[PDB]
Structures are given as structure tokens and as C-alpha cells.
Amino acid sequence: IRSENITNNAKNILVQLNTPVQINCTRPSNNTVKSIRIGPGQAFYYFG
Amino acid sequence: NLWVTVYYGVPVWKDAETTLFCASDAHNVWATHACVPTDPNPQEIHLENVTEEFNMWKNNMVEQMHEDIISLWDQSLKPCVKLTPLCVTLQCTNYAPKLRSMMRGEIKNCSFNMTTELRDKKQKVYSLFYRLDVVQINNKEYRLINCNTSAITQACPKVSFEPIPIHYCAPAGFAILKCKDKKFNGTGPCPSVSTVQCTHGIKPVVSTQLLLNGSLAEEEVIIRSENITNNAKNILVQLNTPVQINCTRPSNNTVKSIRIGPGQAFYYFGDVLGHVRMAHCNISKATWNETLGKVVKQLRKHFGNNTIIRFAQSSGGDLEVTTHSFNCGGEFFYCNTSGLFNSTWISDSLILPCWIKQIINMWQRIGQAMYAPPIQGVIRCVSNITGLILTRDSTTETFRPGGGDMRDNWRSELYKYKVVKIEPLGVAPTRCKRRV
Amino acid sequence: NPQEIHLENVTEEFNMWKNNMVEQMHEDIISLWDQSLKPCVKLTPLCV
Amino acid sequence: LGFLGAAGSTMGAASMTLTVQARNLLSHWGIKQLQARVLAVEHYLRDQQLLGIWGCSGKLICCTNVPWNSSWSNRNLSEIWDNMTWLQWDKEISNYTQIIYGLLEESQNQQEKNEQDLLALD
Amino acid sequence: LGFLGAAGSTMGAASMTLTVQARNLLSHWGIKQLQARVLAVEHYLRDQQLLGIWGCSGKLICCTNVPWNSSWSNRNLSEIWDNMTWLQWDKEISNYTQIIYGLLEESQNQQEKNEQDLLALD
Amino acid sequence: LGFLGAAGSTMGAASMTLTVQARNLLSHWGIKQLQARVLAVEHYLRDQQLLGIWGCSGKLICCTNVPWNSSWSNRNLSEIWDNMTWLQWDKEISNYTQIIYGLLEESQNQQEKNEQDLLALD
Amino acid sequence: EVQLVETGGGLVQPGGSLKLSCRASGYTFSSFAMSWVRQAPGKGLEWVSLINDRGGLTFYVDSVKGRFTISRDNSKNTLSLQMHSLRDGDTAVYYCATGGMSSALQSSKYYFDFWGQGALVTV
Numbered sequence A: 001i002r003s004e005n006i007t008n009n010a011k012n013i014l015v016q017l018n019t020p021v022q023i024n025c026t027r028p029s030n031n032t033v034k035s036i037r038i039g040p041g042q043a044f045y046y047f048g
Numbered sequence B: 001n002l003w004v005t006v007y008y009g010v011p012v013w014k015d016a017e018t019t020l021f022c023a024s025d026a027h028n029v030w031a032t033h034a035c036v037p038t039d040p041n042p043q044e045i046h047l048e049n050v051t052e053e054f055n056m057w058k059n060n061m062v063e064q065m066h067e068d069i070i071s072l073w074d075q076s077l078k079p080c081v082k083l084t085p086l087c088v089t090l091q092c093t094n095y096a097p098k099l100r101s102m103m104r105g106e107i108k109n110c111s112f113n114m115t116t117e118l119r120d121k122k123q124k125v126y127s128l129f130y131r132l133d134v135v136q137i138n139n140k141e142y143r144l145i146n147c148n149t150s151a152i153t154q155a156c157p158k159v160s161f162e163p164i165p166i167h168y169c170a171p172a173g174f175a176i177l178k179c180k181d182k183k184f185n186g187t188g189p190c191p192s193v194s195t196v197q198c199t200h201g202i203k204p205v206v207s208t209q210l211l212l213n214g215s216l217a218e219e220e221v222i223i224r225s226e227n228i229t230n231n232a233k234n235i236l237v238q239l240n241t242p243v244q245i246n247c248t249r250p251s252n253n254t255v256k257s258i259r260i261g262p263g264q265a266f267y268y269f270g271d272v273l274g275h276v277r278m279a280h281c282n283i284s285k286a287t288w289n290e291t292l293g294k295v296v297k298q299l300r301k302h303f304g305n306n307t308i309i310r311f312a313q314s315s316g317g318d319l320e321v322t323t324h325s326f327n328c329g330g331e332f333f334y335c336n337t338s339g340l341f342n343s344t345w346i347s348d349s350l351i352l353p354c355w356i357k358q359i360i361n362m363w364q365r366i367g368q369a370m371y372a373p374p375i376q377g378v379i380r381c382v383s384n385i386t387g388l389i390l391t392r393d394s395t396t397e398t399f400r401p402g403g404g405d406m407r408d409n410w411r412s413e414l415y416k417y418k419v420v421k422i423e424p425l426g427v428a429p430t431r432c433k434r435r436v
Numbered sequence C: 001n002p003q004e005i006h007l008e009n010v011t012e013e014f015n016m017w018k019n020n021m022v023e024q025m026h027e028d029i030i031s032l033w034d035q036s037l038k039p040c041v042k043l044t045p046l047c048v
Numbered sequence D, E, F: 001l002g003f004l005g006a007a008g009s010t011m012g013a014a015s016m017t018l019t020v021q022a023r024n025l026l027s028h029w030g031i032k033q034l035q036a037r038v039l040a041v042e043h044y045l046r047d048q049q050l051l052g053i054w055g056c057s058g059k060l061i062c063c064t065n066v067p068w069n070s071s072w073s074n075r076n077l078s079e080i081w082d083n084m085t086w087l088q089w090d091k092e093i094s095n096y097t098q099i100i101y102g103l104l105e106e107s108q109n110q111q112e113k114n115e116q117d118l119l120a121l122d
Numbered sequence G: 001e002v003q004l005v006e007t008g009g010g011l012v013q014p015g016g017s018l019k020l021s022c023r024a025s026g027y028t029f030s031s032f033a034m035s036w037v038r039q040a041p042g043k044g045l046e047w048v049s050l051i052n053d054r055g056g057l058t059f060y061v062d063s064v065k066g067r068f069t070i071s072r073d074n075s076k077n078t079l080s081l082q083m084h085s086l087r088d089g090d091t092a093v094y095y096c097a098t099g100g101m102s103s104a105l106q107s108s109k110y111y112f113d114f115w116g117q118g119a120l121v122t123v
């Protein structure tokens, strides 16, 4: 546990673990993306 | 009983790839002052008993020149007017419907609802475009060709495109070795090698199919390639005699100017003061035939000694890769070279029709475009064909004009030079010992 | 701190009209001014 | 002759042009030109540092106490100086350069220490 | 050892690694990297200039004619060389560095003038 | 005195301030400031290279074997050292600088070769 | 054919002076160190002086050190010796010879390869 000033509640604390915690994240949605020209050489992408 | 001694200032070197500085002489697109005004004095030291190999196909001076030219060009256009407002639906008819010549249908008379210098006002503008600048949307509705990929920048219409020569110079610690041999095919030893500080002036001429205004071979036509047996590589042919080419745009044009913003204006082709004619180039026919005879004779030295050499027109693609191209007077010309490559060689002017474009996409840079302003008056160009770029497909081999990759236009001038790093420190045995 | 060394027996000519310090100051000021305005709002819409 | 004029000359003959070569080591787009000049300076200084380290700080030609090993391309003495150029010599012994340099550094530190001891003898 | 391997060694022992340290002094965004290289060169040259000024231009170790003052942290002789590291020594005499350097410059100019006079005696 | 304090002093008197002057040689917009520093370094190195080439690598004052030619503004000896400043002297012989430098380089290479031969006498 | 040919010589009074010279060919003059060797009438051989190939380094036997000058002109392919303050003890044949020291790049010899016939000097 590391901090600049451990007695000062205005400072934060960096905690370095000695073991990983595995985290599994997801966006379980099969999305399709579309593309539209909006100028002479420009296009934007969007959630279709 | 010999001792190691140390010598500093030893005349040796190793091949190296470094940055060369640009030196200059002499508004104009190449007058950037990044390229330092110098003394052209071609000081040269002959290396009497030195033979060293060269390889023009691995020459980083070519890569540097390529990047310096593109970078320069782009910086010169950077501060100029962006013709965003011109990529608007355009309404067009033919300029001179009552024309039965090769130019009928080539020039279109188009109108726009154009931006004025005040945000809330529009103006109706009539202007002339070449067929090659527009496509139909489907009077008919048209769009400019740049609308697929880019905005067009107005080409700073005060600045000349005359190809003022530049010199490349070595920095301290480096030297440029000049081949100086004859009949040098681009690779291998050059027993005539000499050391220079700077290259000869090289004109940054940009072209396709044929090489213009470059150096001529000293004795005989020299044919060079990276791999002559590989049909995927092209061939650079350096002539030992110029072929004079006379090009023109024999149409007296008038140019108009419209404000399109708070400090911006664009230039456009107003009208034709007379009668419409097609641009074209004149090549002496006999001279061209002699020129090819020399090229064929030399191809036969290493390829096809007793076989057939056939010349043909380019295979296809857009104009930038199928036609001859050059800038002259500031105008951009595309010429049909099929009349030059129509013969089979087996063991009195010539006229090339030319088209011009206002919307230019140089160096295959997709996403950028330049608008070349039209030029008032009539253009006359005189130039020296100094070389060719050829590619090749039993008993008959077919050769066609190449181009597109601009580095080929610089290898033809820089093949004579190599850059080396001086490494002036070494040891050798002698009979001398320290007193210690 | 204006450290200064008097040159007791030195006489040398000056020419203020050929002074490149002036040219440098001129360019430094213009360049500075322009850089300070560079990131600010362009009032394109007011030219109406 | 002039710069590199002696490059094709024999090693012996070329020893007379060391001065000429030495003087030609010193005599966004623009940033790459500036970078090249800075690197050239660093290169120059590295060569000077070695000459300093080896005890040959202010000479174009100097002698050392490292004997020549016959394993280092023994090519006689007169053959090297009279019938060879420096460009060739630089290839004849290119794999021994680091060995020689290491020896030159060691047989300097040994000398500095001996000199230091002698200066302490009253 | 290697670079700074001798940093924890005694001053005496560490005198044998001067070569190692010397070689590692030389061996818009991009502009700040270029600036750092330029400043490193200027720093290097300042150290070399002092060695030149003091009459110690091509040595890693050299002697001078300036006596050691006992006021400059007299810590004996063997204690300094055998039971102290260079990192500690650099603090023991940090307030005398400018004094010593000034003395080293003066007791050089005096020597150059004496040598110059001797070379004029026929 | 201080930096250039001796500029109005006689050449003789000013010879005592060489140390002072030597130390003050080392001690997009930003790119031009960086360029100036790089060029200052190259200039410095060129002066040092000449001193090295001439056989005067670590001295502020040194002697050479080149005789003074009377054609080079013979202004006596005591007149030059006692009644002239360095600024004036630099004009008195400005057209001979390249001649003198060439002679200084030649009468060094001759010396290095003689030293090399002597070191080969068993 | 290498040849060294001496001239000069003759009888000179003690306290006087004379100069000897030697012309040479059949070899590159500038490639070799040279010397003068004395043959006193009954002593045979004494070394007197040595000069290197560039004419910059000279060495003398102590007995002539303050009196003799050895010199070269490589454009003329000439070796010469100026002898001042002559003594009767200097009566000898003086031989022109090639050899002795060398360039330090070329197998130092420390011996004499060629001899001329010598000038006779009487004092």
C-alpha cells in the first residue's frame, strides 16, 4: 500500500496486489455498423 | 616484433544512408529557402586507383529526393484557398455544340450556385470545365471528380511550377561518390569514380511514359533495370541524343476571378477568344524512328539478339498511368503516345493528341487534389525527350510505356551517385614503440 | 542581474540602422502574436 | 590530391594526407537536417574519446605498447605498407577491430597507474 | 562489473573503472529529444574544457601542483581511499569544489608562463 | 577584469586572461535556437581541431617551429606586445592568417614523421 | 645497377674545411637512408654519420658531432657532407653508403647494402 501522505485524507492510495484478480468483461450484442459519406472524402461510422 | 599504431584521418569509408542537405540557386514553388543558396562550383577529386561498386536500385538518395519533393509540394499548397464550395451539384451543357472536330463535347459550360464573400449571399457563376474534370450524377447534373475523395486546393495562382534545379550535398563527415564511368548499367564497379561535395543540378521534372529534360547518355543508349529477366520490373532507357518535342495548347483563353469568401477567390476558365482547338505534341517522325532503332539495337545486346522487338501502346488504367504527362507553362497535359509505339522490329511530323485537366491528383495521393488555375493566353512548350520508361509483357517480346511511380524519374539522374560515411580511424602494424 | 564588464580602452563603431537585433525582435513579436491567436475562435459567421 | 585523393594510394603514401581527411570531418523538414548535424558531432566525439582513452589524444599518428598479433591477418610488413590501400586493409582486419581496441584501452590504464606511482616517489 | 558497477566500491578500487564510465557519456515532440542530445554534448565539452584548462587534457588520471588543504575535509589518506566510496566523497567536499577548481586553473597559467619563458632561453 | 575585460589592454597584458575567455565559449521558433547552439558547437570543435592538428592540443599558449616572416607585418617585437591590443593585431595580419595556418599544419606533419622514425630505432 | 659515386676530397690544411658529395642512381634515392663511413689509412672502417630518407634526422659519431654536417637533396639524388675544423686524424677515404635506419614501415636494416668507392680526404 503506497501513498504520498498516508495520514492525509486528501491524498489517494495506490494498492498493488500480489495476485491478479481475473475479470471477464463483455458486450454480448451482435452489432452491425453502417457508413455514410458526409463530405468530399469523409464518412462517419455508426451503430446500425 | 611489430607494434600496433593508430592513425586518425585515414581515407576510408563505409556505405551509409544519411540525410543530405538541399542546396540551391536563382514566385516559384521550389523557392522555399529550405534549400540553401550555394556556390555550384563542382569541386571534384578523382580517385585514381579506386574501384567501387554502385547499386542504383538501392540508392537512398532517391528515396530522399522523392520525399523532399512531395513534402515541398504539399507545403507550398498548404496556405492556399480550399475550394470546398465547388463540390456542389453543377448544371452543364456543351460549350460549343456546333463543332465537328476532335474537341466537340470536350469543353463544358457549367453553372453553379456559388458562395459569395458574405455568409448569407449566393451568386450565379458560369465557368468552363474539361470533360475529364466532371462526371454525371444521373441540361445534365454533374459533379466534380474530386467529390469521391477530397477537397481541392486552389494552386496558389501566383506561383510558378518551373523545375528550378537543385543540388544534393553531403554534410560534414560524408562524401558523395560519382560513378563517372561510361556505359554504366546501374550496378557493379565504377573504375572512374570521383568524389564530389554536391550533385549536379537536377531539375525536378515530373512525367510519365517519357522522361523529359534529363541527362543524356555520353556515348550510346543505355538500358537499365533492377532485374532484366523479370517482367515485373520496368526498364529505364537513357538516350544518347535528345528527341525534340514541341507541345502546345493553341487556344487563346481568358481567365476570370470570383470571390468565394472573406479573402478567397478562385480562378476559372472564362472563355475562348477565337476557336477551339485540341492540344497536341509534335515529334519529328524520322528522329523518333532513329531513336527506336537505337533502343532496339541495344535491347538485342542482352535480350533477343536474333528475335523480334515489338512496341505497343499502354494497356489501360486512368490517364495518369496510360498517357504521357507533363506540366508545361503551369498547365497539365495528358498525351496519347500510341503513335510512338506502333512497330515491330525484326532481326513529316508525328502528332500526339493531348487533353488537359484542371483537377490534379499527383503521386497517387488519394485524399488530396489540386486545382490548377487555367492560364491566360496560349501555351508553347519545347522540351527534350531524354529517356523512356518501358515495361515488357516465343520469338517476339512486346514493350510498352510505363510510369506512375515517380521514383523512376529520379533514379535516372541519381544513378551516378553514392553516399558514403567517412570512417577515419584505423590501425596497422609498424616498427615503432612508445618509450614508456 | 545586469552583469556588465566595462571595456576601459576600447572604442568600437555601432550602426543602429543595420542592426539585426531589430530584425529579430520584429519577427519574434509577430510570430508570438500570431501563435497566441492561433487556437482561438474564428468569427467566420460574423461576415454576414 | 585533396579530400580522399589518397584513397587509392598505398597505405604508406596515404599516411601523408591525414590532415586533409581530418579537416573534412567538421567542415517538420528542417529538423532532420539538424538531427544529422547533431549525430555527426556525436560520431566525431566518439572517435576523439577513443584516442583520448588510448593515450593518443593530440596526434594524427601515434604508437602504442600493444604488439601486433600474427593471428591478426599477418601480411608481412612491407606488403601492407607498399602494396595495399587503406580500404583493403580495413577489410583484412575487420574482425579484429574490437579486440585491438580492447587491448589498446587496457594497455593505457596500466600505463597511467605506473606513471601515477612514479610521481609519488620522493 | 560494467557501467557504475564500481559505484559501491571504495574510491581506490573504483579508480580502475574510469574507462567504463567515460565511454557511457557519449554512447513539436521530436525537437525535445534533439534538445536533450545537444545539451548532453555541451555538458561533455564543458568537462573536457576544464581538463584542458587545468593541464590535464588527455588523461583519465592526472596530477597537479595544488596541495591539498587540511581545511578541505581532512579525512586522512588511507581512510579516503580504502573506506569510502566516490558517492560519499562527493558530499564530503561538495563546498570546496569551486575553490579547488579555481586553484587548479591558477596553478596552470603559472606553469604555462614558466614554460614559455624557458623556451626562449637560447 | 572579467570577460573581455582585457580587450582594450595590450597584447602582453591580455595574455593573462585566456582562461576567462575560453570558458565563455561554452558557458517553428524553438528550432532556430537549437540550430544556433549546434552551430556554436561546430565552431568550437573547428578551433579545437586546428589546435590538435598543429600539435598544440591541450594548451592555451604554445610554441611552434614556424619562424615569423618579416613580410607578415613586421612591427618589431616590443611594439606588438606592449603598445598594441589584440583587436588591432587581428587586422595587422588579417591577410596572412591562412598562410600561417598552412605553415603550422605542414610543420607538424614533418614533426610527427620524425618522431615516428625515432621510435623505431632499437 | 645501383651506383654511388663520390666526388670532392683533396688535401686540406688542418683547421680548414671541405665538402664531399655523392651522386646516386639505380634505386629510388628518396626510399633509402644513407651514411658516410670513414676508412682511415690502416683502420679500415669507422662510422661517421647517418641521415634518414627524408633528410630530417641526422646522427653523428661524437668525434665529428660539433664539426660535420650531413645533408640531402632528393630532387638531385645527392648526398653530401660538409666537414669543418678539420684535423689530421680525419685523413681517410670517405664512403657513400646506403643503409642503416629506415622509415619504420619498411623492415629496418641497421646494415649497409651499397657502397661507393669513396673520396680521399687528407688533412
Ligand SMILES: *[C@@H]1O[C@H](CO)[C@@H](O[C@@H]2O[C@H](CO)[C@@H](O[C@@H]3O[C@H](CO)[C@@H](O)[C@H](O[C@H]4O[C@H](CO)[C@@H](O)[C@H](O)[C@@H]4O[C@H]4O[C@H](CO)[C@@H](O)[C@H](O)[C@@H]4O)[C@@H]3O)[C@H](O)[C@H]2NC(C)=O)[C@H](O)[C@H]1NC(C)=O
Pocket: B027, B160, B162, B163, B205, B212, B213, B326, B327, B328, B329, B330, B375, B376, B377, B380, B381, B382, B383, B384
Ligand atoms: C524543358 O526545358 C525547357 C527549356 O527551359 C522548358 O521550356 C521553357 O518553359 C518555360 C516555362 O514554361 C518557358 O518560359 C515562359 O516563356 C513565355 C514566352 O513568352 C513567357 O511569357 C513566360 O513568362 C510568364 O510566366 C512567368 C512565370 O514565372 C512570369 O514570371 C512572367 O512574367 C510571365 O508571366 C505572365 O504571363 C502569364 C501568362 O498567362 C500570366 O499568367 C502571368 O500572370 C504573367 O502575366 C515564361 O517565360 C520557356 O520559354 C520554355 N522554353 C522554351 C524554349 O520554350 C520546358 O518546359 C522543360 N520541360 C518541362 C516538362 O518543364
Ligand SMILES: *[C@@H]1O[C@H](CO)[C@@H](O[C@@H]2O[C@H](CO)[C@@H](O)[C@H](O)[C@H]2NC(C)=O)[C@H](O)[C@H]1NC(C)=O
Pocket: A005, A006, A007, A008
Ligand atoms: C500529511 O500532510 C499533513 C498536512 O495537512 C501534515 O500534518 C499536518 O500539520 C498541520 C500543522 O498545523 C496539522 O494541523 C495537521 O492536523 C496535520 N495533519 C495530519 C494528518 O497530521 C502531515 O504531517 C503529513 N503527513 C506525513 C506522513 O508527512
Ligand SMILES: *[C@@H]1O[C@H](CO)[C@@H](O[C@@H]2O[C@H](CO)[C@@H](O)[C@H](O)[C@H]2NC(C)=O)[C@H](O)[C@H]1NC(C)=O
Pocket: A048
Ligand atoms: C429507427 O426507426 C425507423 C423509422 O421507423 C426504422 O426504419 C423503418 O424500418 C421499417 C422496417 O420494415 C421499414 O419498413 C421503414 O420504411 C423504415 N423507415 C424508414 C424511414 O426507412 C429504423 O429501422 C429504426 N432503426 C433501427 C436500427 O431499427
Ligand SMILES: *[C@@H]1O[C@H](CO)[C@@H](O[C@@H]2O[C@H](CO)[C@@H](O)[C@H](O)[C@H]2NC(C)=O)[C@H](O)[C@H]1NC(C)=O
Pocket: B227, B228, B229, B230
Ligand atoms: C530476377 O527475379 C527472378 C524472380 O522471379 C529470379 O529468378 C527466378 O528464380 C525462381 C526460383 O524458383 C525461378 O522459378 C524463376 O523462373 C526465376 N525467374 C527468372 C526470370 O529467371 C531471377 O534470377 C532474377 N534475375 C536476376 C538477373 O537477378
Ligand SMILES: *[C@@H]1O[C@H](CO)[C@@H](O[C@@H]2O[C@H](CO)[C@@H](O)[C@H](O)[C@H]2NC(C)=O)[C@H](O)[C@H]1NC(C)=O
Pocket: B109, B110, B126, B128, B270, B271, B272
Ligand atoms: C455558358 O452558357 C451561358 C448561358 O446561355 C452563356 O451566357 C449567356 O451569353 C449570352 C451572350 O449574348 C448572353 O446574352 C446571356 O445573357 C448569357 N446568359 C447568362 C445567364 O448570363 C455563357 O456565355 C456560356 N459560357 C461561355 C463561356 O460562353
Ligand SMILES: *[C@@H]1O[C@H](CO)[C@@H](O[C@@H]2O[C@H](CO)[C@@H](O)[C@H](O)[C@H]2NC(C)=O)[C@H](O)[C@H]1NC(C)=O
Pocket: B244, B245, B246, B282, B283, B284, B349, B382
Ligand atoms: C519545335 O519549334 C522550333 C521553333 O521554336 C522548331 O525549330 C525550327 O525548325 C525549323 C525546321 O527547318 C528551322 O528552320 C528553324 O530555324 C527552327 N527554329 C529554331 C529557333 O531553331 C523545331 O523544329 C520544332 N520541333 C519540332 C519537333 O517540330
Ligand SMILES: *[C@@H]1O[C@H](CO)[C@@H](O[C@@H]2O[C@H](CO)[C@@H](O)[C@H](O)[C@H]2NC(C)=O)[C@H](O)[C@H]1NC(C)=O
Pocket: B313, B314, B322, B323, B336, B337, B338
Ligand atoms: C490513343 O489513340 C488510340 C487510337 O484511337 C486509342 O486506341 C483505340 O481505342 C479505341 C477504343 O474503343 C479502340 O476501339 C481502337 O481500336 C483503338 N485503336 C487501336 C489502334 O488500338 C488509344 O486507346 C488511345 N490511348 C489512350 C490512352 O487513350
Ligand SMILES: *[C@@H]1O[C@H](CO)[C@@H](O[C@@H]2O[C@H](CO)[C@@H](O)[C@H](O)[C@H]2NC(C)=O)[C@H](O)[C@H]1NC(C)=O
Pocket: D067, D068, D069, D070, D071
Ligand atoms: C594472438 O591471437 C590468438 C588467437 O586468439 C591468441 O591465442 C589464444 O591465446 C589464449 C590465451 O589463453 C588461448 O587460450 C587460446 O587457445 C589461444 N588460441 C589459439 C588458437 O591458440 C594468441 O595468444 C594471441 N597472441 C598474442 C601475442 O596476443
Ligand SMILES: *[C@@H]1O[C@H](CO)[C@@H](O[C@@H]2O[C@H](CO)[C@@H](O)[C@H](O)[C@H]2NC(C)=O)[C@H](O)[C@H]1NC(C)=O
Pocket: E067, E068, E069, E070, E071
Ligand atoms: C586552507 O583553507 C583555509 C580556509 O580558507 C585558509 O585559511 C585562510 O587563509 C587566508 C589567507 O589570507 C586568511 O586570510 C584566512 O583568515 C584563513 N582562514 C582561516 C580560518 O584561518 C588556508 O590558508 C588554506 N591553506 C592552504 C594551504 O591553502
Ligand SMILES: *[C@@H]1O[C@H](CO)[C@@H](O[C@@H]2O[C@H](CO)[C@@H](O)[C@H](O)[C@H]2NC(C)=O)[C@H](O)[C@H]1NC(C)=O
Pocket: F067, F068, F069, F070, F071
Ligand atoms: C616571407 O614572405 C615572402 C612573400 O611571399 C616570401 O618571399 C617569396 O618566396 C618565394 C619562394 O619561392 C618566392 O618565389 C617569391 O618571389 C618571394 N616573394 C618575394 C616578394 O620575394 C619569403 O620567402 C617569406 N620568407 C619566409 C622566411 O618564409
Ligand SMILES: *[C@@H]1O[C@H](CO)[C@@H](O)[C@H](O)[C@H]1NC(C)=O
Pocket: A001, A002, A003, A004, A005, A006
Ligand atoms: C514508507 O516507508 C518510510 C520508511 O521510513 C516511511 O517513513 C513512510 O511513511 C512510508 N510511507 C507510507 C505511505 O507509509
Ligand SMILES: *[C@@H]1O[C@H](CO)[C@@H](O)[C@H](O)[C@H]1NC(C)=O
Pocket: B089, B091, B111, B112, B113, B124
Ligand atoms: C440555384 O438554386 C435555385 C433554387 O431553386 C435553383 O433553381 C437553381 O437551378 C440553382 N442554380 C444552379 C446553377 O445551381
Ligand SMILES: *[C@@H]1O[C@H](CO)[C@@H](O)[C@H](O)[C@H]1NC(C)=O
Pocket: B135, B143, B144, B145, B146, B147, B148
Ligand atoms: C467515384 O468512383 C466511381 C468508380 O468507378 C466512379 O464511377 C464515380 O464517377 C466516381 N465519382 C466521381 C465524383 O468521380
Ligand SMILES: *[C@@H]1O[C@H](CO)[C@@H](O)[C@H](O)[C@H]1NC(C)=O
Pocket: B185, B186, B187, B188, B223, B224, B225, B226, B227, B228, B302
Ligand atoms: C549490369 O552489368 C553487370 C555486370 O556483371 C551485370 O551483372 C548486370 O546484370 C547488368 N544489369 C543489367 C540490367 O543487365
Ligand SMILES: *[C@@H]1O[C@H](CO)[C@@H](O)[C@H](O)[C@H]1NC(C)=O
Pocket: B285, B286, B289, B293
Ligand atoms: C523506321 O525503321 C524501319 C526499319 O525497317 C523502316 O522500315 C521504317 O520505314 C522506318 N520509318 C521511318 C519513318 O523512317
Ligand SMILES: *[C@@H]1O[C@H](CO)[C@@H](O)[C@H](O)[C@H]1NC(C)=O
Pocket: B300, B301, B305
Ligand atoms: C548479338 O548481335 C550481334 C550483332 O552484330 C552479333 O554480332 C553477336 O554475335 C550476337 N550475339 C550472339 C550471342 O549471337
